[PDB]
PDB file of C-alpha atoms and ligand atoms in Angstrom:
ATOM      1  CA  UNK P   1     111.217  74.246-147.931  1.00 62.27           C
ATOM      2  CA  UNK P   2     112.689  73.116-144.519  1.00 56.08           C
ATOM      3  CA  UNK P   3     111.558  69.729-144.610  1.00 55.61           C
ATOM      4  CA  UNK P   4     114.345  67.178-145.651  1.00 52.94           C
ATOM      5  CA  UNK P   5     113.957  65.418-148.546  1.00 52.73           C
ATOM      6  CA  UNK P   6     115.394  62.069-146.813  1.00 56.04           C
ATOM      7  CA  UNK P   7     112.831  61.863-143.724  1.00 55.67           C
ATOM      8  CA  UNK P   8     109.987  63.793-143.378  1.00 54.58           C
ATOM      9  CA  UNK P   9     108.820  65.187-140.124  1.00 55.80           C
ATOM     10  CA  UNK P  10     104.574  64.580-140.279  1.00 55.04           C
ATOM     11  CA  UNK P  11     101.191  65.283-138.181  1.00 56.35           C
ATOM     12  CA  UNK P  12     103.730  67.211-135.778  1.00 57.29           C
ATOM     13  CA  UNK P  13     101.252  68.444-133.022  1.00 55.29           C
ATOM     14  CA  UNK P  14     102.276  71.043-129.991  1.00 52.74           C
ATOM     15  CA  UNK P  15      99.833  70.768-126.695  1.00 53.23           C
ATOM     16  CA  UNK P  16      99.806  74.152-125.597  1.00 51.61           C
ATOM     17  CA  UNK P  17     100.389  77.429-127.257  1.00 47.20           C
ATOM     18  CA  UNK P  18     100.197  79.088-123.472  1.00 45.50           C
ATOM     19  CA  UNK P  19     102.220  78.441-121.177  1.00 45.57           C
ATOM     20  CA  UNK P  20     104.183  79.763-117.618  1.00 47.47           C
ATOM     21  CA  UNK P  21     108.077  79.300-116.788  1.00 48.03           C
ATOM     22  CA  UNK P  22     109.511  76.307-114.831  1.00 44.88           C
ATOM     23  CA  UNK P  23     109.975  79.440-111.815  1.00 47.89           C
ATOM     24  CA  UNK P  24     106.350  80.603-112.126  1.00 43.30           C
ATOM     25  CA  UNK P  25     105.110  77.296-111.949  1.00 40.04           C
ATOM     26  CA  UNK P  26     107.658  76.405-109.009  1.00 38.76           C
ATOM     27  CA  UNK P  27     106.582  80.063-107.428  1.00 41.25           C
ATOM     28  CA  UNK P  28     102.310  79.410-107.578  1.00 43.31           C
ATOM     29  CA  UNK P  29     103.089  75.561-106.749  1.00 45.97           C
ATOM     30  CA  UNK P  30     105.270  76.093-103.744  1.00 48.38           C
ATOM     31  CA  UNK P  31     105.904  79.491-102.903  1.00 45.78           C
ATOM     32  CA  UNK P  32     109.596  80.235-104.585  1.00 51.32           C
ATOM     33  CA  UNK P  33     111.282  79.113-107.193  1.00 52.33           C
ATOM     34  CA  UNK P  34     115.071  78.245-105.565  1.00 49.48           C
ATOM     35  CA  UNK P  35     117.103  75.185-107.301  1.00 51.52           C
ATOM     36  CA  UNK P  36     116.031  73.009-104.573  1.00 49.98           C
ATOM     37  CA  UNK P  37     111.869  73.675-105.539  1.00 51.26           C
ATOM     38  CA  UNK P  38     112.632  73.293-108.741  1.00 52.20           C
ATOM     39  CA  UNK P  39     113.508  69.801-108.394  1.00 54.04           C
ATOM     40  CA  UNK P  40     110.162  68.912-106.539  1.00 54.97           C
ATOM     41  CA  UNK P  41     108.442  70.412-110.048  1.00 58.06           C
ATOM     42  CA  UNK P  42     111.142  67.939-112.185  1.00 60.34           C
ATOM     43  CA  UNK P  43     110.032  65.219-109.839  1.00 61.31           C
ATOM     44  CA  UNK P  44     106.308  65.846-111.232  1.00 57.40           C
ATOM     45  CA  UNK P  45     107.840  64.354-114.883  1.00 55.66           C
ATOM     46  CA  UNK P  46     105.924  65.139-118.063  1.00 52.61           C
ATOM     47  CA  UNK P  47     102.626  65.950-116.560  1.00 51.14           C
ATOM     48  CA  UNK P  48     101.280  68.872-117.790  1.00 49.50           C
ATOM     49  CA  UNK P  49      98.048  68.553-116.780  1.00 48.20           C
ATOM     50  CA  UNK P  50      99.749  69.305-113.438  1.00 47.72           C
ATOM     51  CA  UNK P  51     102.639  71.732-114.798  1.00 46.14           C
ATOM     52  CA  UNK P  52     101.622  74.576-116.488  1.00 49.84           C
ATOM     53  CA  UNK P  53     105.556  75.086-117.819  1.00 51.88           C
ATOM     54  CA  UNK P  54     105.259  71.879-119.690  1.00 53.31           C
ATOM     55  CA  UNK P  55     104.836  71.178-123.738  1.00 52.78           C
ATOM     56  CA  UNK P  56     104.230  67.825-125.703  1.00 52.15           C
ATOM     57  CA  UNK P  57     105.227  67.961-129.068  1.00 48.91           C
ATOM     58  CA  UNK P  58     104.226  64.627-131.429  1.00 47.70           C
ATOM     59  CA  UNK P  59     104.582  63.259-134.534  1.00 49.38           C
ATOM     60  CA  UNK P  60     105.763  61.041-137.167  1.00 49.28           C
ATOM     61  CA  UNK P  61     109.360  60.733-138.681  1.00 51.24           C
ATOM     62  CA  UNK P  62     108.419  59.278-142.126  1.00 51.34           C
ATOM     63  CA  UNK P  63     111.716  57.694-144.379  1.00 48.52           C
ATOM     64  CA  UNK P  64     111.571  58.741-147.650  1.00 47.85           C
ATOM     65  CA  UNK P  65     115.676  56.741-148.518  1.00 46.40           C
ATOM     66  CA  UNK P  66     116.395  53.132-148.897  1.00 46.56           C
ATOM     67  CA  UNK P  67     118.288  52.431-146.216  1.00 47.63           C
ATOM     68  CA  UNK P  68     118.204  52.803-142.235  1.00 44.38           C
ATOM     69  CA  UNK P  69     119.318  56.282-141.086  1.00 44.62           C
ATOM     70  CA  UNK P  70     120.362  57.233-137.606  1.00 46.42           C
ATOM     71  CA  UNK P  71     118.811  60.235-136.220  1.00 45.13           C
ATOM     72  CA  UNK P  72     118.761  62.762-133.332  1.00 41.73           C
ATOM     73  CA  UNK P  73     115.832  64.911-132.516  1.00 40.28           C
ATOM     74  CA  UNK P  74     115.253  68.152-130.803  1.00 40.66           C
ATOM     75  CA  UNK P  75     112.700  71.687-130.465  1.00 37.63           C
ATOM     76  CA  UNK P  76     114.349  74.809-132.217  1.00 41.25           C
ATOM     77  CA  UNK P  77     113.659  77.943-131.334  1.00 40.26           C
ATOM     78  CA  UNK P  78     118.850  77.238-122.484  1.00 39.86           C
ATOM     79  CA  UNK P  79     115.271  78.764-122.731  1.00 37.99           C
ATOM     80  CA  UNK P  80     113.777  75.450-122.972  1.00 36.42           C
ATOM     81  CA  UNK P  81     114.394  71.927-121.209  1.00 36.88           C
ATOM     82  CA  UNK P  82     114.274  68.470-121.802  1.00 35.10           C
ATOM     83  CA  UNK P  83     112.014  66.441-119.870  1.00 35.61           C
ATOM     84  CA  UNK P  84     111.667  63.146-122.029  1.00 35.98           C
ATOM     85  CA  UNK P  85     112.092  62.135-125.910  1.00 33.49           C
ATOM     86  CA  UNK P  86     110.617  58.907-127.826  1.00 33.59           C
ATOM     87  CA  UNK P  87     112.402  56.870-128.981  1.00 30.70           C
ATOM     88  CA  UNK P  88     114.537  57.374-125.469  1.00 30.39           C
ATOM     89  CA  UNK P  89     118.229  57.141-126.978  1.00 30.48           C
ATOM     90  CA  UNK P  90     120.467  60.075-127.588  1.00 28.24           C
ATOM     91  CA  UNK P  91     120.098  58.341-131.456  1.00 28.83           C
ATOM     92  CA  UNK P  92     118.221  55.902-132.504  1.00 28.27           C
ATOM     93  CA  UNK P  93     117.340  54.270-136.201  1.00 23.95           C
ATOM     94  CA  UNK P  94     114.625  55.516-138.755  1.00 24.40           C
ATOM     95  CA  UNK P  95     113.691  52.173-141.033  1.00 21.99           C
ATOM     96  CA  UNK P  96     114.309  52.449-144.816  1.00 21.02           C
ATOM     97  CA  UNK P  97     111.077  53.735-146.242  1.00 16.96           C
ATOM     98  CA  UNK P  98     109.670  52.861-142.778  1.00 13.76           C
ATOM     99  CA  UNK P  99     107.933  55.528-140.065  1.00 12.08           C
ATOM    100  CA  UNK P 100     109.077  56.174-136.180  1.00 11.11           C
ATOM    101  CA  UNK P 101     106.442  58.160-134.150  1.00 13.96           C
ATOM    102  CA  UNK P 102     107.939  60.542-131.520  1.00 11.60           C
ATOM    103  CA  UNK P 103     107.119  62.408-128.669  1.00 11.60           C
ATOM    104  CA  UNK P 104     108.931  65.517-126.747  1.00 10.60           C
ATOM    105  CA  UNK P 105     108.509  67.002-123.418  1.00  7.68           C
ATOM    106  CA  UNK P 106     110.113  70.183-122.503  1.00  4.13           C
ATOM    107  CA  UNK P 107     109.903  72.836-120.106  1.00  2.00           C
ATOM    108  CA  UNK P 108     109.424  76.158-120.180  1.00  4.49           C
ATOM    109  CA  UNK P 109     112.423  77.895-118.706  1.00  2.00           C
ATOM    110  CA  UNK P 110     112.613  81.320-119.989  1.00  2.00           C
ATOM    111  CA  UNK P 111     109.526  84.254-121.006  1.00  2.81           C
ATOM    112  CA  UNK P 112     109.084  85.074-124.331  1.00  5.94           C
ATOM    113  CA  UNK P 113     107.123  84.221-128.021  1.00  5.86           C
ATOM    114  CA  UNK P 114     109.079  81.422-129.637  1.00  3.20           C
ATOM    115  CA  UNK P 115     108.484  79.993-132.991  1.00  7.47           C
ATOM    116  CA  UNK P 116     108.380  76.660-132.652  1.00  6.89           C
ATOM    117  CA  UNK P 117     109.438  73.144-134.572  1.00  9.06           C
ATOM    118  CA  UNK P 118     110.590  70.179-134.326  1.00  9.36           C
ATOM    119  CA  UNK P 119     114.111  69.701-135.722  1.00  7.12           C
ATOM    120  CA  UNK P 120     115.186  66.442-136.938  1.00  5.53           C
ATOM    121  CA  UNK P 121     119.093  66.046-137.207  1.00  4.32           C
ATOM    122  CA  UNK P 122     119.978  62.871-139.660  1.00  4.49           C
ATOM    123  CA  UNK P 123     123.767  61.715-138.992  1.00  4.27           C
ATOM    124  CA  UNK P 124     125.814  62.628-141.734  1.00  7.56           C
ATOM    125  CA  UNK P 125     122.810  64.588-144.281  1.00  3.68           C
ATOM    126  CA  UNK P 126     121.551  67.324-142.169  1.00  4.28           C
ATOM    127  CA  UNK P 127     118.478  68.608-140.515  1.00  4.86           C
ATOM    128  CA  UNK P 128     114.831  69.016-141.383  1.00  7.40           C
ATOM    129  CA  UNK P 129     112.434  71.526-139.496  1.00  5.75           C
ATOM    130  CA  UNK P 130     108.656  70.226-139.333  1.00  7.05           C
ATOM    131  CA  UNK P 131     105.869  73.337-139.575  1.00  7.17           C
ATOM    132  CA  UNK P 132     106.194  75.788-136.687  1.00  5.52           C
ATOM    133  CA  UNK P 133     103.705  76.951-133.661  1.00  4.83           C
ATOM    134  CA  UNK P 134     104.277  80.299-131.911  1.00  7.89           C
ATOM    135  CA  UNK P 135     104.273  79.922-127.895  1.00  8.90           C
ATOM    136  CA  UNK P 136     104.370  82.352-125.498  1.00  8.83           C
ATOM    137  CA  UNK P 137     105.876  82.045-122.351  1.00  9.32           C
ATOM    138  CA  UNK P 138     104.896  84.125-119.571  1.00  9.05           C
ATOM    139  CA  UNK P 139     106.526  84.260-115.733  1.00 10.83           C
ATOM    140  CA  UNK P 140     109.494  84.562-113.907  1.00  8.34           C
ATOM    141  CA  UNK P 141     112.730  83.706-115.522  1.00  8.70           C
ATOM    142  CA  UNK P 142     114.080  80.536-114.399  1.00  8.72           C
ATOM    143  CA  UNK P 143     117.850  80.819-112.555  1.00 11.62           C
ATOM    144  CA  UNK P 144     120.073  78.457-113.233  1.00 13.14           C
ATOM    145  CA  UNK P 145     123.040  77.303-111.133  1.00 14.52           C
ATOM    146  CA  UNK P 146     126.186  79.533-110.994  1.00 14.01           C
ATOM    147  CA  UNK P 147     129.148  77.940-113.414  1.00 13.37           C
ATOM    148  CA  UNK P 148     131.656  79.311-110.900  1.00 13.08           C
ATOM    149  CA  UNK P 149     133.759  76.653-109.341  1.00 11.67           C
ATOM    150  CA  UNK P 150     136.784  76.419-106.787  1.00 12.85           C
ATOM    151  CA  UNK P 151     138.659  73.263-105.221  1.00 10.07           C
ATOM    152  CA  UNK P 152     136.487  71.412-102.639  1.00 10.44           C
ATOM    153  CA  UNK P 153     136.204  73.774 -99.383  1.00  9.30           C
TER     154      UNK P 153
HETATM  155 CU1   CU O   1     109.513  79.308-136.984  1.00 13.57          CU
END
């Protein structure tokens, strides 16, 4: 099994099993997808009822230890994007036998089928995958911004 023992991840729910790139979205929206467009479509937020490259993912973290456990949370399986995580902080605290619903919303950057979950990272015990959806991703791939650099011109 790939759920941890010490927090399970429950009722995980994906919105979309469809869905278009960050670029193709950016491309039907407003005509091209260039770095500078693509910040009008991050502007949008998690909206995808607008953005057809977004994906909510929700559920419940449910403690299954004594004690308060910091945690981390993230999609597996660069190709996708953070928009917005609840609880906001980069890691927050899952109550002794206690439950913390959450909520992720990512974007699409890359085409492809992807196998899904939601991956819960618990400081200093490991990780636990909840259940996983396939998506497919159709569109454009999304460019990203050169990692070449120089001295200021
Ligand atoms: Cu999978």
């Amino acid at each position: 099994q790939l759920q941890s023992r010490f927090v399970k991840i429950e009722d995980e729910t994906f919105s979309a099993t469809r869905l278009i790139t960050k670029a193709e979205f950016a491309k039907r929206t407003f005509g091209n997808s260039d770095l500078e467009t693509l910040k009008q479509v991050d502007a949008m937020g998690c909206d995808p009822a607008r953005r057809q490259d977004v994906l909510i993912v929700t559920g419940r973290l449910v403690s299954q230890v004594k004690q308060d456990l910091n945690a981390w949370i993230s999609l597996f399986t660069n190709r996708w994007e953070f928009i917005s995580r609840d609880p906001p902080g980069n890691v927050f605290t899952i109550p002794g036998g206690g439950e913390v619903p959450y909520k992720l919303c990512l974007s699409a950057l890359e085409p492809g089928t992807y196998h899904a979950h939601t991956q819960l990272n618990i400081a200093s015990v490991g990780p636990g995958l909840g259940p996983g959806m396939s998506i497919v991703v159709e569109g454009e791939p999304t460019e990203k911004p050169s990692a070449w650099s120089h001295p200021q011109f």
